[PDB]
Amino acid sequence: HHHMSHYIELTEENFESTIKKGVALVDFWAPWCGPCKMLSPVIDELASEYQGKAKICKVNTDEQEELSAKFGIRSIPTLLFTKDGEVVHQLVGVQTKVALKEQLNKLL
């Protein structure tokens, strides 16, 4: 029984085409980051709850240095909200599920 991934792993190759259309939430994280691991289950739940309605994505900053530099990530967790390929909000820290849902719904 492996771990299940409801989220979309983003990379330099697939980033632009993945968020080109629709509403996306992008979680910049790293496997050594305590607050990132605290935020991870909320991203799993949102990815499942918003399946087919919004793109819930993750960027591993250890593996995607060019993407994190592209958005000026200096701290993680960083949560990025995009609509139709354009950045709308960029939040830092262990955001609450409620606040993330509301921001998603507003964009939807």
From TrEMBL:
GO terms for biological process: cell redox homeostasis. One of its GO terms (cellular component) is cytosol. The record marks 27 as: Deprotonates C-terminal active site Cys. InterPro entries: Thioredoxin, Thioredoxin-like_sf, Thioredoxin_CS, Thioredoxin_domain. CDD domains: TRX_family (cd02947). Disulfide bonds join 33-36. The active site is at residues 33, 36. The record marks 34-35 as: Contributes to redox potential value. It comes from the Bacteria. Residues 4-108 form the Thioredoxin domain. GO terms for molecular function: protein-disulfide reductase activity. Keywords: Disulfide bond, Electron transport, Redox-active center, Transport. NCBIfam families: thioredoxin. Belongs to the thioredoxin family. This is Thioredoxin. It comes from Helicobacter pylori. The lineage of its organism: Bacteria, Pseudomonadati, Campylobacterota, Epsilonproteobacteria, Campylobacterales. The gene is trxA_2.
